[PDB]
From TrEMBL, chain C:
Palmitoylated. In natural infection, inactive HA is matured into HA1 and HA2 outside the cell by one or more trypsin-like, arginine-specific endoprotease secreted by the bronchial epithelial cells. One identified protease that may be involved in this process is secreted in lungs by club cells. Disulfide bonds join C144-C148. This is Hemagglutinin. Binds to sialic acid-containing receptors on the cell surface, bringing about the attachment of the virus particle to the cell. This attachment induces virion internalization either through clathrin-dependent endocytosis or through clathrin- and caveolin-independent pathway. Plays a major role in the determination of host range restriction and virulence. Class I viral fusion protein. Responsible for penetration of the virus into the cell cytoplasm by mediating the fusion of the membrane of the endocytosed virus particle with the endosomal membrane. Binds to sialic acid-containing receptors on the cell surface, bringing about the attachment of the virus particle to the cell. This attachment induces virion internalization of about two third of the virus particles through clathrin-dependent endocytosis and about one third through a clathrin- and caveolin-independent pathway. Plays a major role in the determination of host range restriction and virulence. Class I viral fusion protein. Belongs to the influenza viruses hemagglutinin family. It is found in: Host apical cell membrane; Virion membrane. Residues 38-76 form a coiled coil. Homotrimer of disulfide-linked HA1-HA2. It comes from Influenza A virus (strain A/Hong Kong/1/1968 H3N2). The gene is HA. It comes from the Viruses.
């Protein structure tokens, strides 16, 4: 077995620096190079850079020059990626991945990333989700303008489970996410009573209970 | 070296899936199941790694590589990326069920607190429409609308096995009060005739 | 630049010259014309075409050598191997530098020599019928039409049939 | 000065042997995951950084010399000889070296242990009646505890002497604890003997002998070994560096000081311009 | 003392360019530490090399010492250890109850065993016995195991190995 165990989730603040560690197991760290790959939440994989274990030469995307540093600790079979001057858009899951070439070539030109770590969620921002009612049948809640993606929406947490559609969140020119949660209701029940939506946002620690 | 590939291949279990990355300059194919680290499944350009079923295959023409998944099922459906450094755009694999139904259109006017924010985003909902291929157009005082509608579709229901779309468009308060009526019609594959629903701010 | 022809009294290269390396431009009653001297150009090209195969005939073929990269630290033997390889690299780097400098200097002197040789040959053809103006150009003191000019370029110029007119024009 | 490389090793005209996960010594000894390299020949053995050992923990005194001579020979052709070990148990195995589902060992080595309750003084001989050198790879087993020593070899302290007419080589195994490697605190020390034509090999041991199963046919030629992670490609190139194959039209190169084949000389300068024309004097 | 392959140790120590010594916690159970001698007089009393620990029998027994130190740092560690060659068998058994000790120092990759010899040698500063100095480089992520049943001049720690522009020169200028 070959495994790359990464650190825990980091919750930072803009302008700070973060350090993600990747403990390799089942092989010698200096036998393989290590690429670091970012995935913003729902925005596809983004290559961050590459560390050549056994001689320490790096290769960074020009977007990350100066504000990212990759190092290794051969004693503990660990590799560190440190990102300085953190920004809001750096909120992402970071993966360490094993690449083969270290001697004679830069491995990532010719070899794939066969083994990946579990990823660390480095979230550097927070924004509360603004909840708006949706009444015209059907009725729902529009969750708008929250930066960290994971947000759950319930309806009394046990009341509405059928007919509820939680549309996946969407990007924006502002960089914030927004989704909707709508349920169909009998035409009689819409005027007699109104239901309540509970919007839970763990990174912002914000829970807004709103009717219709 | 920009890599491109055709996104959002939607299909039922048990048939062909082809994804096409056109290198503009060693392309490897990775699968990311939902909520999991990406997994390498095509090394080299056509080579398979250890533990990846023979169903997956790769093929290279002069500058276009294609990944073929055969007899796909739940675990074969994921987000697929090509890599050469640069990644591809990403193509989602979704399961499809064979049930056809008509869209159910609802229109909800913008909220008052949404208005005072100035971003009077309004959403049109299409419920239980099938199939996936159903473009939806907004009508702005009977005029073309583009560049502001964001569409989001829910995956196949567990039992209903259909789709539901919400399209939201936002505009500044300085210009939202200038239009006053909007519609959202479907160019449905099932329904040739678009269904119009309009609402006036009154 | 030992002879002072190129970057010397010639003072200027001809970017309109693409036929050869060395050539003539003539102005007479008929009009301006230009040609290239194939013999001098071929001499220079022949003396330049090799010039590296004559010192380094081919790549020597080496198959099994000492190790030149080491993981651990041994001591005497590793130090000796590193010293041997570093000495070889320094000596060959010096050889490359000196060879390139020497060959470049000789090539410059060679091309300048071919230019001067063409100039002297042309002057010797024009025994008393022409005068060197000092900028690499000859003033010919007689009616010299296109056939005359091509005879000069050809090498079959006959100074005797123009000598009377040329002397009459020069010394009055 | 040639300063760039394609990044790939051309597989012609030289016989390139890509060693996937295997080092030359592991392929020589017969590491199970190296079994595909049996009887292989090469002009250049390309040894990858991902190579690892997955057999009994061993140790080669003068590892570099054995690696160099095996690489220079350029072949792993192994001839099994009839060695008569009387009074000992052959084909010893271990779970650190798992060939298939069960325990195993190096395919080119024979782990002899006591038979019944005795371990006699083994005294065997093989003459070299061929006209080529024979390479014999043998070993000495260093146990971790005295109990293990006496359980495998009844003698409290064995020794192994391998000798020819011209030279001899004796090893006294040591009993001590060592770092845990793949489950074991014991070791194997690998030694080699070259038996020249017309010579004799005598192996006399009273314990801790990892006997040879035969000889490797030694050869002389253009063979070598290289440490490189560059991929192999289908193409023609005479000069190979760890960075890949490079053209040898230029007299000098700045890619790598490690080279194989008809290669340009390595220099410290990244560029050297040779004038192939006259001195350039433009107008104005 | 006596260094087999003296030139290699001198070269590598000079190349490292530092004598920075880190004391490690070595647990020697059942032996007497800090052995000394009058040939090595530190101050007024007997002494020894400051970077070496001369272990002798405690009470009337000398157990099989078996110690370990892992290298969890990202630099090489240089360990200088020794083997004490006594002059007479009486001295051997008076310091080490075993009639013939041995010292094995090993890592994951390599091992090194020394059998001390008992013999008379030229008189040097009052002694016919010797110390043989050996060294081990423990790379990052490796382990040092010292197993000895007699005649061990144990290390007190490691020297921090470095790479740079350092060297040694013989000169009276
Ligand atoms: C063809 O292939 C070869 C082989 O791959 C290529 O050679 C490599 O080329 C790159 C790019 O030029 C070199 O990287 C550059 O390194 C300099 C510093 O160089 C010095 O250190 C090097 C590394 O030393 C570590 O590793 C060696 C080997 O493992 C070890 O012995 C050392 O002791 C040291 O080990 C430490 O680090 C390890 C890894 O972290 C740890 O495990 C260990 O415990 C230690 O902590 C060394 O190799 C180098 O060169 C020596 O050897 C070469 C022979 O190749 C020789 O030419 C030299 O004269 C030396 O003898 C030096 O000693 C670094 O400063 C450079 O960084 C640039 O870029 C960064 C940003 O990216 C900037 O911040 C810097 O300021 C600088 O601008 C760069 O990384 C690499 O060293 C070199 N050699 C090797 C073996 O990789 C060659 O380039 C290829 N050519 C072509 C055309 O493709
Ligand atoms: C002389 O001194 C040396 C050095 O102290 C001793 O060597 C140690 O011996 C012990 C066994 O007696 C070894 O312990 C074993 O280590 C194995 C390796 O563990 C490492 O790697 C794993 C990851 O796989 C890490 O989790 C772990 O922390 C270590 O880094 C273990 O896998 C073994 O576990 C097995 O046995 C235990 C026993 O209870 C079970 O609980 C386990 O489930 C498993 O079955 C075991 O722990 C130790 O590694 C040796 N150290 C060194 C440096 O070699 C000698 O034993 C000693 N000899 C004498 C005669 O005194
Ligand atoms: C095996 O064989 C070896 C070689 O023969 C023996 O080694 C000799 O051992 C004896 C002791 O048994 C040594 O004798 C001692 O030598 C010391 C050095 O003396 C030299 O230097 C002084 C200058 O300082 C000169 O004057 C002298 O001539 C020598 O050149 C002396 O300092 C010692 O003197 C002390 O002891 C005597 C004993 O009576 C006192 O009288 C003195 O006052 C003083 O206290 C002593 O003489 C001899 O040097 C060793 N030779 C060598 C070559 O090593 C081994 O002993 C022997 N072992 C066995 C088991 O047989
Ligand atoms: C140049 O000279 C040659 C030989 O004398 C002659 O054949 C030729 O006609 C001359 N004129 C040219 C080539 O114009
Ligand atoms: C290797 O070659 C020898 C003879 O050259 C032969 O006897 C032996 O069977 C071969 N073994 C393999 C595995 O090819
Ligand atoms: C030497 O340095 C180490 C740490 O670098 C320290 O622990 C030790 O006390 C120092 N000793 C002396 C004598 O300076």
């Amino acid at each position: 077995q070959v495994q790359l165990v990464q650190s825990g989730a980091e919750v930072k603040k803009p302008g700070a620096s973060v350090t993600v560690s990747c403990q390799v197991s089942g092989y010698t760290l200096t036998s393989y190079g290590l690429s670091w790959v970012r995935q913003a939440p729902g925005q596809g994989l983004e290559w961050v850079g590459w560390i050549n274990t056994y001689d320490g030469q790096t290769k960074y995307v020009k977007k990350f020059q100066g504000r990212v540093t990759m190092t290794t600790h051969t004693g503990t079979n660990t590799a560190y990626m440190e990102m300085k001057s953190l920004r809001s858009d750096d909120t992402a899951v970071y993966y360490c991945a094993r690449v083969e070439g270290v001697r004679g070539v830069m491995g990532f030109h010719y070899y794939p990333m066969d083994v990946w770590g579990q990823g660390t969620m480095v979230t550097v921002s927070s924004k509360g989700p603004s909840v708006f009612p949706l009444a015209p049948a059907a009725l729902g809640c529009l969750v708008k303008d929250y930066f960290p993606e994971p947000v759950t929406v319930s309806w009394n947490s046990g009341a509405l489970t059928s007919g509820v559609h939680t549309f996946p969140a969407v990007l924006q020119s502002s960089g914030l996410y927004s989704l909707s949660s709508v349920v169909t209701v009998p035409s009689s029940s819409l005027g007699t009573q109104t239901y309540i939506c509970n919007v839970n946002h763990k990174p912002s620690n914000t829970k807004v209970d709103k009717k219709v | 070296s920009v890599l491109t590939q055709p996104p959002s291949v939607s299909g039922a279990p048990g048939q062909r899936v082809t994804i096409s990355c056109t290198g503009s300059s060693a392309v490897h194919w990775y699968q990311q199941l939902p909520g999991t680290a990406p997994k390498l499944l095509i090394s080299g350009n056509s080579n398979r790694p250890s533990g990846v079923p023979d169903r997956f295959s790769g093929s290279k023409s002069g500058t276009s590589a294609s990944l073929a998944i055969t007899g796909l099922q739940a675990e074969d459906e994921a987000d697929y990326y090509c890599q050469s450094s640069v990644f591809g755009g990403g193509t989602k694999l979704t399961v499809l069920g064979r049930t056809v139904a008509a869209p159910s259109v609802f229109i909800f006017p913008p909220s008052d607190e949404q208005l005072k924010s100035g971003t009077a985003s309004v959403v049109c909902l299409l419920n239980n429409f099938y199939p996936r291929e159903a473009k939806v157009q907004w009508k702005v005082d009977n005029a073309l609308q583009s560049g502001n509608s964001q569409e989001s579709v829910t995956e196949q229901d567990s039992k209903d096995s259909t789709y539901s779309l919400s399209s939201t468009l936002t505009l500044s308060k300085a210009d939202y009060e200038k239009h006053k009526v909007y519609a959202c019609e479907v160019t449905h594959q099932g329904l040739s005739s678009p269904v119009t629903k309009s609402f006036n701010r009154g | 630049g030992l002879f002072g022809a190129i970057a010397g009294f010639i003072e200027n290269g001809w970017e309109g010259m693409i036929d050869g390396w060395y050539g003539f431009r003539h102005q007479n009653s008929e009009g301006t014309g230009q040609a290239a001297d194939l013999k001098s150009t071929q001499a220079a090209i022949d003396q330049i075409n090799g010039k590296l195969n004559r010192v380094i005939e081919k790549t020597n073929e080496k198959f099994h050598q000492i190790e030149k990269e080491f993981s651990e630290v041994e001591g005497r033997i590793q130090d000796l191997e590193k010293y041997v390889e570093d000495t070889k690299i320094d000596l060959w780097s010096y050889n490359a530098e000196l060879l390139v400098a020497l060959e470049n200097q000789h090539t410059i002197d060679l091309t300048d020599s071919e230019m001067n040789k063409l100039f002297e040959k042309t002057r010797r053809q024009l025994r008393e019928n022409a005068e060197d103006m000092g900028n690499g150009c000859f003033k010919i003191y007689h009616k010299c039409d296109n056939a005359c000019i091509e005879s000069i370029r050809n090498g079959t110029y006959d100074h005797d049939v123009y000598r009377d007119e040329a002397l009459n024009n020069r010394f009055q | 000065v040639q300063s760039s490389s394609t990044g790939k090793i051309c597989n012609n005209p030289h016989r390139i042997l890509d060693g996937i996960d295997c080092t030359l010594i592991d392929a020589l000894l017969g590491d199970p995951h190296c079994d595909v390299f049996q009887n292989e020949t090469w002009d250049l053995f390309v040894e990858r950084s991902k190579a690892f050992s997955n057999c009994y923990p061993y140790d080669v005194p003068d590892y570099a010399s054995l690696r160099s001579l095996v690489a220079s020979s350029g072949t792993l052709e192994f001839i099994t000889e009839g060695f008569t070990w009387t009074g000992v148990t052959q084909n010893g195995g271990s779970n650190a070296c798992k060939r298939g589902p069960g325990s195993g060992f190096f395919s080119r080595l024979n782990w002899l242990t006591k038979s019944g309750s005795t371990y006699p003084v083994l005294n065997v001989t093989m003459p070299n009646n061929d006209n080529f050198d024979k390479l014999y790879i043998w070993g000495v087993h260093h146990p971790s505890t005295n109990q293990e020593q006496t359980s495998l070899y009844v003698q409290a302290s064995g020794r192994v002497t391998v000798s020819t007419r011209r030279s001899q080589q004796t090893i006294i195994p040591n009993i001590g604890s060592r770092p845990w490697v793949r489950g074991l605190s014991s070791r194997i020390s690998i030694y080699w003997t070259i038996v020249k034509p017309g010579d004799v090999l005598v192996i006399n041991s009273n314990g801790n002998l990892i006997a040879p199963r035969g000889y490797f046919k030694m050869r002389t030629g253009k063979s070598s070994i290289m440490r490189s992670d560059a991929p192999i490609d289908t193409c023609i190139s005479e000069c190979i560096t760890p960075n890949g194959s490079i053209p040898n039209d230029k007299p000098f190169q700045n890619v790598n000081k490690i080279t194989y084949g008809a290669c340009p000389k390595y220099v410290k300068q990244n560029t050297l311009k040779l004038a192939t024309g006259m001195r350039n004097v433009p107008e104005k």
